[PDB]
Design a protein around this motif. Structure first.
Motif, mmCIF file in Angstrom:
data_model
loop_
_atom_site.group_PDB
_atom_site.id
_atom_site.type_symbol
_atom_site.label_atom_id
_atom_site.label_comp_id
_atom_site.label_asym_id
_atom_site.label_seq_id
_atom_site.Cartn_x
_atom_site.Cartn_y
_atom_site.Cartn_z
ATOM 1 N N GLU A 1 1.374 -0.859 4.693
ATOM 2 C CA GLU A 1 1.710 -0.084 3.612
ATOM 3 C C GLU A 1 1.529 -0.694 2.146
ATOM 4 O OE1 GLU A 1 6.141 0.956 4.399
ATOM 5 O OE2 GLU A 1 5.254 3.025 3.599
ATOM 6 N N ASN A 2 1.304 -2.032 2.075
ATOM 7 C CA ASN A 2 0.635 -2.765 0.836
ATOM 8 C C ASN A 2 0.207 -4.117 1.118
ATOM 9 O OD1 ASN A 2 0.113 -3.898 -1.770
ATOM 10 N ND2 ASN A 2 2.038 -2.835 -2.565
ATOM 11 N N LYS A 3 -1.158 -4.034 1.446
ATOM 12 C CA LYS A 3 -2.072 -4.817 1.898
ATOM 13 C C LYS A 3 -2.074 -6.138 1.189
ATOM 14 C CE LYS A 3 -5.012 -5.587 4.694
ATOM 15 N NZ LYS A 3 -3.711 -6.114 5.212
ATOM 16 N N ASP A 4 -2.380 -5.956 -0.067
ATOM 17 C CA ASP A 4 -2.466 -6.874 -1.113
ATOM 18 C C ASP A 4 -1.162 -7.753 -1.517
ATOM 19 O OD1 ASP A 4 -4.982 -5.668 -1.536
ATOM 20 O OD2 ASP A 4 -4.255 -4.730 -3.432
ATOM 21 N N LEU A 5 -0.117 -7.150 -1.424
ATOM 22 C CA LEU A 5 1.196 -7.689 -1.572
ATOM 23 C C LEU A 5 1.707 -8.394 -0.380
ATOM 24 C CD1 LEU A 5 4.682 -6.551 -1.247
ATOM 25 C CD2 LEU A 5 3.762 -7.944 -3.296
ATOM 26 N N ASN B 1 4.049 1.582 -2.552
ATOM 27 C CA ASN B 1 3.884 1.743 -1.193
ATOM 28 C C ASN B 1 2.358 2.492 -1.092
ATOM 29 O OD1 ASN B 1 6.484 1.753 -1.950
ATOM 30 N ND2 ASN B 1 7.156 3.070 -0.155
ATOM 31 N N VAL B 2 2.175 2.961 0.185
ATOM 32 C CA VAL B 2 1.010 4.185 0.283
ATOM 33 C C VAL B 2 1.364 5.431 0.215
ATOM 34 C CG1 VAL B 2 -0.649 2.852 1.813
ATOM 35 C CG2 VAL B 2 1.326 3.773 2.837
ATOM 36 N N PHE B 3 2.740 5.795 0.570
ATOM 37 C CA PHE B 3 3.071 7.083 0.531
ATOM 38 C C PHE B 3 3.780 7.525 -0.697
ATOM 39 C CE2 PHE B 3 6.884 5.576 2.105
ATOM 40 C CZ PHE B 3 8.046 6.841 1.987
ATOM 41 N N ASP B 4 3.796 6.307 -1.660
ATOM 42 C CA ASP B 4 4.294 6.495 -3.039
ATOM 43 C C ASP B 4 3.378 6.471 -4.255
ATOM 44 O OD1 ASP B 4 6.770 7.070 -2.128
ATOM 45 O OD2 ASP B 4 7.648 5.592 -3.417
ATOM 46 N N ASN B 5 2.349 5.361 -4.002
ATOM 47 C CA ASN B 5 1.616 4.929 -4.920
ATOM 48 C C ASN B 5 0.041 5.313 -4.709
ATOM 49 O OD1 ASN B 5 3.227 3.851 -7.570
ATOM 50 N ND2 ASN B 5 3.960 2.705 -5.681
ATOM 51 N N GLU B 6 -0.133 5.528 -3.498
ATOM 52 C CA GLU B 6 -1.300 6.034 -2.839
ATOM 53 C C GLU B 6 -2.279 4.758 -2.486
ATOM 54 O OE1 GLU B 6 -2.341 8.812 -5.998
ATOM 55 O OE2 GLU B 6 -2.694 10.436 -4.271
ATOM 56 N N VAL B 7 -2.558 4.003 -3.493
ATOM 57 C CA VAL B 7 -3.395 2.598 -3.379
ATOM 58 C C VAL B 7 -2.573 1.667 -2.825
ATOM 59 C CG1 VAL B 7 -5.113 1.316 -4.303
ATOM 60 C CG2 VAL B 7 -4.420 3.295 -5.532
ATOM 61 N N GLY B 8 -1.604 0.860 -3.739
ATOM 62 C CA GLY B 8 -0.719 -0.334 -3.212
ATOM 63 C C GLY B 8 -1.385 -1.401 -3.576
ATOM 64 N N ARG B 9 -0.819 -1.887 -4.907
ATOM 65 C CA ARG B 9 -1.344 -2.989 -5.397
ATOM 66 C C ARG B 9 -0.111 -4.000 -5.773
ATOM 67 N NH1 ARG B 9 -4.074 0.799 -9.578
ATOM 68 N NH2 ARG B 9 -3.332 -0.730 -11.276
#
Ligand SMILES: Nc1ncnc2c1ncn2[C@@H]1O[C@H](COP(=O)(O)OP(=O)(O)OP(=O)(O)O)[C@@H](O)[C@H]1O
Ligand SMILES: [Mg+2]
Lengths: 428, 22
Positions: A200-204, A343-351
């Motif tokens: 859901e957030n790889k970088d985080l 998120n992914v289903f909120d912010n599309e990317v996820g930074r």
């Protein structure tokens, strides 16, 4: 059904009980002869142990007879199967214990494997008797947010093994409390991923590992015993990560991993790519394979959400023989500052960033909220990199008034700090 | 009658010794 009186069970040397307790089911166990471990933790002779809502083996090191009672179990379906992969765990520990006493500082092991291969169980057992034999305090690093250990779910943690774990808990034990207890609790180092799963957030998630690693280093630099002791790093399954395993590289570098344990067979191609991918950094001499452990059963999602639910309650109220008394406080809308991760289903990317959250009944009801150390007025760069103080449950979001019912772990003031919302919900 | 405790800060945990618990 079962029965509500005691039953004798003679459990042969080298065998597992293997138990699957479900809803409400309560298993009381009392040993009167022999040696029994639950993932390495010995059971004391002649007193009652009580188990609720988790699957677990009781292993017989020696001869062993015990008395048990459970309305959800009977002699008919009991399951007592001989464990064979146990010796693998033994001469793997004494392998680590040789590193602890010969090297300048102890080993830092990652336990890597497929879905339900024995990672956590193997991690627990290795901790359980890194302490039993020559009194070490291995630092245990849980890197799987879905798995609650010493804390609530959705966060990675580092916890030193002071003394014995709680055998009767799927969560290993619990954090420190206001008084003194019959079990020495642990001081965890929590970081808070906050989300359902890694993808859901790889970088985080890597950012979590980054700052967890830093703190871990600072204790290792300052604590002689923990540094002298090992360091056992438990990871999620490689089916939760990338094909190339870019995340593992980042775990290895930030946590200074020097030895890798791969729970893998010798037809599984995972073993080969592990050698070619991590051999360059660790050296093939420091990568070990372990034929997958006996008794390790599949785990579904519902059971896993159940275990997460148990832990949230356990954080606020404790267990049966712990009984903690948390605090309920009325609080205004203005009394709170809340952010939430990408998120992914909120912010599309996820930074690596968090968005300010408006208070909505659909946003905060039954939500677990991570409380930081940063000010209520701090900017997102300061909050994203500030240590977690503890967690709070929100009972009621009254919207006609500007008010909130928050459950705290500590009787006292609402800590006027910055707060991060999680994706984790709990209703009693 | 007991309660859960807050966690230590980053620096504060690094200085912490588990012998205090024991
Ligand atoms: N010898 C055993 N007998 C019976 N049950 C076992 C045994 N070893 C482990 N288990 C159970 O199997 C389940 C899954 O094991 P474990 O938690 O170690 O999986 P894992 O390797 O951490 O993989 P994942 O991270 O995907 O869960 C656990 O609930 C554990 O209690
Ligand atoms: Mg696991």
């Amino acid at each position: 059904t079962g029965d509500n009186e005691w039953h004798k069970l003679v459990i042969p040397k080298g065998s597992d009980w293997q138990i699957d307790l479900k809803a409400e089911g309560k298993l009381i166990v009392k040993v009167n002869s022999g040696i029994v471990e639950i993932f390495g933790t010995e059971l004391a002779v002649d007193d009652e142990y009580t188990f609720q809502n988790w699957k677990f083996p009781i292993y017989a090191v020696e001869e062993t007879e015990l008395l048990w009672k459970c309305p959800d179990l009977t002699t008919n379906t009991i399951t007592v199967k001989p464990n064979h992969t146990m010796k693998y765990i033994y001469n793997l520990h004494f392998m680590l214990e040789k590193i602890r006493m010969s090297n300048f500082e102890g080993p830092r092991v990652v336990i890597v494997g497929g879905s339900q291969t024995g990672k956590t169980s193997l991690s627990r057992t290795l901790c359980s008797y890194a302490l039993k034999f020559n009194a070490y305090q291995p630092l245990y690093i849980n890197l799987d947010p879905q798995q609650p250990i010493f804390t609530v779910p959705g966060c990675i943690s580092a916890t030193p093994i002071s003394d014995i774990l709680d055998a009767q808990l799927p969560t290993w034990g619990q954090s420190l409390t206001s008084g003194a207890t019959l079990l020495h609790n642990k001081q965890p180092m929590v970081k808070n991923f906050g989300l359902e799963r890694i993808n859901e957030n790889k970088d985080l998630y890597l950012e979590c590992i980054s700052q967890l690693g830093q703190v871990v280093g600072q204790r290792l630099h300052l604590d002689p015993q923990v540094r002298r002791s090992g360091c056992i790093v438990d990871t999620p399954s490689i089916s939760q990560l990338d094909e190339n395993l870019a995340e593992l590289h980042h775990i290895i570098e930030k946590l200074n991993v020097n030895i890798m344990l791969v729970l893998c067979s010798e037809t599984d191609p995972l073993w080969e790519k592990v050698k070619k991918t991590f051999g360059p950094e660790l050296g093939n001499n420091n990568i070990f394979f372990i034929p997958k452990l006996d008794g390790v059963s599949a785990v579904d999602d519902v059971y896993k959400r159940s275990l997460q639910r148990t832990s949230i309650r356990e954080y606020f109220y404790g267990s049966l023989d712990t009984a903690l008394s948390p605090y309920a406080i009325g609080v205004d809308y203005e009394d709170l500052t809340i952010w939430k991760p990408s998120n992914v289903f909120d912010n599309e990317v996820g930074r690596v960033e968090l968005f300010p959250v408006t208070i909505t009944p659909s946003n905060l009801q039954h939500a677990i909220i991570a409380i930081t150390f940063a000010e209520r007025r701090a900017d997102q760069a300061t909050v994203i990199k500030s240590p977690i103080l503890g967690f709070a449950l929100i009972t009621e979001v009254n919207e006609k008034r500007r008010k909130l019912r928050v459950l705290l772990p500590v009787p006292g003031r609402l800590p006027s700090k910055a707060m991060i919302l999680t994706s984790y919900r709990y209703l009693e | 009658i007991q309660s859960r405790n807050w966690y230590l800060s980053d620096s504060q945990w690094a200085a912490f010794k588990d012998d205090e618990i024991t």
